[model samples]
Every structure is written in structure tokens, then in C-alpha cells.
Target chain A: ISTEEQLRRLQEEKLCKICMDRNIAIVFVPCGHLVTCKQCAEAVDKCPMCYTVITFKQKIFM
Target chain B: EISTEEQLRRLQEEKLCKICMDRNIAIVFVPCGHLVTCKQCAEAVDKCPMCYTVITFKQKIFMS
Candidate 1:
């Protein structure tokens, strides 16, 4: 990848893989994938990666 | 002009904590073995951002 592409990927990697912006602050249950912000996490029911049923959720400090 | 080693170095430098995006990864979330946080950020996290595993505990991962 070009330097620009690499840099873009790097920046993208630091953001919530789901929303692509806000810092990841929520984790999905069962699947345990953290890919969204608090607001976004509550709006969804299944895990984004494995479609696992969200048995429960907990707010994290970070 | 960069070698594979150099690329690896650059990649490491770019792997900022996914939560804060400010510090190098120094903490591994437990039960998941995910290195997506720095010591400071790690302390504030209770779950693995990559896999959403309940962070039962965390351990330092020295890379230096």
C-alpha cells in the first residue's frame, strides 16, 4: 500500500471498526466483539461479527 | 524505501490503542489475548474492543 493508504488504514484502525469514527466504547455479548459506540451498541441486537444474540451488555470505563 | 522489518516497525508505531488512539499497545485483555490498548487506556477498559469479551483481568505485555 502507498504511504497514504497505509496511513488511512492506520487511522481507520484506531476508530470504532463499526461506526468508523467514535472511539469504541461498547462490546457485543457472546461474540465479544467491540465495534461500536455506546449509542450505537444499544441500538443493535446481534453481534456484528458473528450475529450472536446479545445476551447482555455492560458499559466499560474506556 | 523500506524493508519488511521497517514496515513492521512502522506498523507497530501506527498500532495506537484502539480506544484512545494515543498510546502504544501495552495491555492484553484477558480471556481474549487482544492487544488493543495502552496501559493507561487498558486500565479504563472493562472489555476487549476487538472481541467484546468481558475483561476479567488484564496483563501487561512488554514489547520493548
Candidate 2:
């Protein structure tokens, strides 16, 4: 596999063992990427802590 | 080291920790502990939630 992977490369199952839901928690902002939880959503409008330039929005209450 | 991406795939043939349920295996910090958290989780918690290693205080707006 190439060294450089796209943001989509991140999946929930591959993120953490503690929370299996880590990868699929949500997708938004920062090129409409995923890999965040309901709590992390409070940091910013885009990628927040990561600063991924978020664009999409989640309607779900999470 | 298994690519963090390839490490966390659906058809992972790689071994998983017997406990903790973290897929990111053997990611040791400082001395011990297998922290299986995403970059988001890491930046969010800043430390191990299990160990109570927390990061900067962010407002917990997760009222759900």
C-alpha cells in the first residue's frame, strides 16, 4: 500500500478497540470527513482540534 | 509497524490485544499500555480515558 492515504482511509473498526464505534461515529466538515465522536463535535465548526476544514453537518443527535 | 490505516481494516489478519478491545496494537506510550484510539480520540482525550489521563478541559456539550 502507498504511504500516503486519503482521509477516507480512516475507518471506525480501525480506530480504537475501546470504542468500536470510533470510526463510524460521524462524518462532517474538513472535506466532509469522518472519525469523531459526539463529544469532539464541540471543539469547532470544521475539523475542530484537527482543523480538517469541515463542510457537512450532522442532523443526528449522536 | 503496521500502517495505522491497514492496521484498522475490516479483514484485519493482524492480531488484536486480548483485552481493552483496542485495534491499534502495541502502540506503547512512554513505558507501557496499548492505547487503541484514533487520532481524534487521542487528541480528544489527550490521554487514556481508562487510566484517567485526560487532556485540556473542553466543554462537554454531549448532553445526549
Candidate 3:
């Protein structure tokens, strides 16, 4: 459930079932749009990890 | 590291590096066995990717 169901009297919330299952790392690409692990991103020049042109250098999490 | 015979040998082997260099190549070290592969060759495997062809191994000696 990657999409959200809207409710009138309650909070509009989305479900990311796959995200819950997978071990995803939130990387803040020097560009933007944080997502994915460093290892996967480093595998391909173009990130299949997120399907984007890598816009900036990566910073390792401390 | 370049010696006379080595320099001459390198002149012969320079083409290999040049081929990789022109492609702006970077290497991946497949720690288990694949890391040392040539990118083009890996894609067109000369043999099984997981295959090891060595018949035996004796450690190299460094000292006299």
C-alpha cells in the first residue's frame, strides 16, 4: 500500500508496505530527494537504486 | 617500478590499459573472485563467471 486513503474525520495517511519490508537507507544526495543505501548507489553510475542521474557527491552517514 | 625490460614489456601491454583508460574505466573488486575482471570480458565471459581454472597453487616466495 504505497498510496494513501483519505478520510474526512481522521488523518490522511499513506502506507508504504514495501518500505516496511525492505532495509532502505535514507541518503540525502548532495542534490536532494533522500533515499537508498550507499552500496547500491555506488554499484551503477546512474542510480537504478532510485532511477536518477546522481546529482551530487554522497556523504557517508556518521 | 619501470625497468628497461619492464618498460619494453609495458610498451606491449600498454594497449590493455589504454583500452580501459579510454573508457574512463573504474574497477570493481568482487571480493570473492570477480573483482579483477575486465568489464567487457565479464559481460562476454570467456568462461563461466564463477569458474576457477587453476589446477594448483603454491604461494610465491619473496625472499632469497
Candidate 4:
């Protein structure tokens, strides 16, 4: 694939796992997975990747 | 070397699926990524046993 398409694909992959639109901005600890945007992250008590109870969420830039 | 008793305990844990307790857990439910049941019993429910959310997909987890 061309560099243009490759970059685009990478960008698409970072989209929020729930909304699939906004960029991911929170890291769910215990599970330590970054899979959701800040908006949706606040609504989650369980980590989507491991189902561990989310005790803390840290905002990320990626 | 691991004792025979330790091996038996480990084997017992692997066989306990927490749902049915009859068959071993074979797949993990995605979006939750929790391995909670065997392949034969995976389709019987839509919600994850751990978080109680509807499962988005299933992925095989190889414990071996």
C-alpha cells in the first residue's frame, strides 16, 4: 500500500472502540488498555478489553 | 519439579469454566476479551459473564 493509505489506516485504527469516530483519549487502568475517547470512557465501569472493573481512567493524547 | 498434587490442582482450574463447570472455557468474548466458556456453549448467550454487556465478537484463546 502507498504511504498515504497506510497512514490513513493507522489513523482509522485509533478511533474510539465504542464510537468508532472520535480519537481514543483514555487509558483504562488495571487493564491498561486505550480503547475509547474521553466522552465514552467516563461512562464505562468495566474495561472493554479485559472486563476488569475500571478503578481509574487516565486521559491520553494518542 | 512440580508436584503431582500441584498439577492436579492446575488441571482442575483449567477445566472449570465458571459457567457450566462441565466443559472448559475455549473462547474469549471480544469487546470484553473474557474467556468464560467453551466453544460449544459460547453461542448460548449474548452477554458477557464478567461485565454483563452484550458481546461484540468471539476470539479463540489458546491457553496451551
Candidate 5:
């Protein structure tokens, strides 16, 4: 149904791009990109979305 | 179908402060421009929790 499709799209937007399992919880600072969860954010030195040097990995509540 | 009440509730939860996980975000860290803490937690932190930049100052934010 259209309703289900809408819900699915919304859910997809929140998924971590790296693992695609968890909701995005970390916001990479300096570049201000948020694409990964806390687990995946720790594994990278740069912003996954912008390739900018990551200076801070702030955990966001959502 | 998702109800309006459910969506509003989810939005409220999303706006909660990441530091205390209680109050809504009321402070924005300068330089990095990250808004992730309540007034209480913002005062206790010396650096931006998101980018770890030394906080030069904090700007209070109000939400409608």
C-alpha cells in the first residue's frame, strides 16, 4: 500500500549507511554530516558522506 | 496508516538532548554549531560534544 511505502521510505532515511542495520546516531562535526551510527562512526577518521577530516563524533538522540 | 499523534511524538523524541537525554536541546555550541545538549549539560562541558572543539561560547536556542 502507499502508506507502507511511505513508512518504508522514512525508515530507510534513518538507517546507517555503513552497516545499514542501526539508526543513525552520530553526527560528524566540522563537515556536519550524519550518516552513521555510533558503532560505525568509531571505525572511520573522516566523514563518510563528505570525506572531510572528522574532528568530533557527537552522539545524537533520535 | 500512521496517525498524526504518533508522528508528533516521534518528533519530540528526536529533539531530546543527547547529553542528558531528558530535556529538549536548548544550547548550541559555538564554532562547531552543534545543538545537542540541554542547559545543564551544556554548562558542564568545556568542548563541543559533537566536534570536540573548545567551546568559545554557548548560544541559547528556543524552540516553538
Candidate 6:
């Protein structure tokens, strides 16, 4: 694969699924899905990707 | 060629610890199974940074 292509994929993978503007920085517990940033994470109680009840939220750095 | 090399470097950098962004990932969170922090950052946290699971245990990973 081309380097540019790889870079694009990596960048896309890091984007917040909810907003698509910021990088994903939050992880919802029990579901273990990371699909949103801290800002977007605060507005939801369930995992955006899996709809699992988010009992806890974690802020990750990347 | 230069651009390609630069892109490769960036991709590699992105795989490093999300917390420190400096050291390699050294700890793995149990249950959540996320490996996104270095040893130092792992020590400072009681829950998995990726899933907020209360860390029952930590496993050190070795990268070849």
C-alpha cells in the first residue's frame, strides 16, 4: 500500500465518530468502544457505536 | 520519495503511547483490552483509559 494511503486510513481511524471534527479521545466502559472525543462523549450515556450503557468514561490521549 | 518516507514516519508515530506520545506502549488494560498508554501513564491511572474499566490487573507487553 502507498504511504499516503496508509496515512489517510490512520487519520480516518482516529477521528471521532460522533463529530468527525476531533480525534477520538474517550472510551466507554463495558462496551470497550472508542468512538468519540471528550466533548461528544459528555453528551451521550451510551456507546455511539454499540449502544451499550456507558457506565464509565475514560479520556485517552493520542 | 521524501513524502512517502515522512508519511511512514507519521504512521509509526501514531502507534506510540496515546498518553505520553513519547514512549512505547507498555501496559495493557484488563477486560477492556486496550493498549494505549506507557508504563508511566499506566501507573497514574486506576481505570483503563480506553474503556474506563476498573483495572483489576495490568499486563506488560513486549514489542519486537
Top candidate by DockQ: 6
Clashing pairs in 6: A61-B18
Tell me how many residue pairs clash in candidate 5: 1
Off by over 4 Å in 4: B1-64
Deviation from native of the Cα of residue B1 in model 5, angstroms: 10
Q: What is the DockQ of each candidate?
A: 0.04, 0.07, 0.01, 0.02, 0.05, 0.13
| Candidate 3 ranges with C-alpha deviation above 4 Å | A1-22, A26-31, A60-62, B1-64
Ranking by TM-score: 6, 5, 4, 1, 2, 3
Worst 10 residues of 4 chain A by lDDT: A2-11
lDDT of 6 by residue, A1-62 (tens): 98788778777877888899998876667666767888998899987677879877765543
Q: Rank the candidates by DockQ, best first.
A: 6, 2, 5, 1, 4, 3
On the 0 to 100 scale, the lDDT of residue B8 in model 1 is 49
Candidate number with the higher TM-score (3 or 5): 5
**In candidate 5 chain A, what residue range of length 10 has the lowest lDDT sum?**
A1-10
For residues B6-52, what per-residue lDDT tens digits would candidate 5 score against the true structure?
A: 65456556568887878878766765667778889898899887878
Cα lDDT tens digits, model 1, B1-64, are 2665565457656457777877866665666767678888877667787788898866554332
| Candidate 3 chain B weakest lDDT stretch, 10 residues | B55-64
List CA RMSD, all candidates. Answer: 9.6, 13.3, 21.9, 15.0, 7.8, 7.5
Please report, as a value between 0 and 1, the fraction of native contacts recovered by candidate 2.
0.02
Candidate that would win on TM-score: 6
lDDT of 3 by residue, B1-34 (tens): 2544454443334223223433311222222222
Fnat across every predicted model, in order? 0.02, 0.02, 0.00, 0.00, 0.02, 0.25
TM-scores for all candidates? 0.45, 0.26, 0.22, 0.46, 0.54, 0.58
lDDT: worst 10-residue window of model 1 chain B: B55-64
DockQ comparison, 2 vs 3, better candidate: 2
* Comparing 1 and 3 on lDDT, the stronger one: 1
Q: Which pairs, if any, clash in model 5?
A: A56-B51
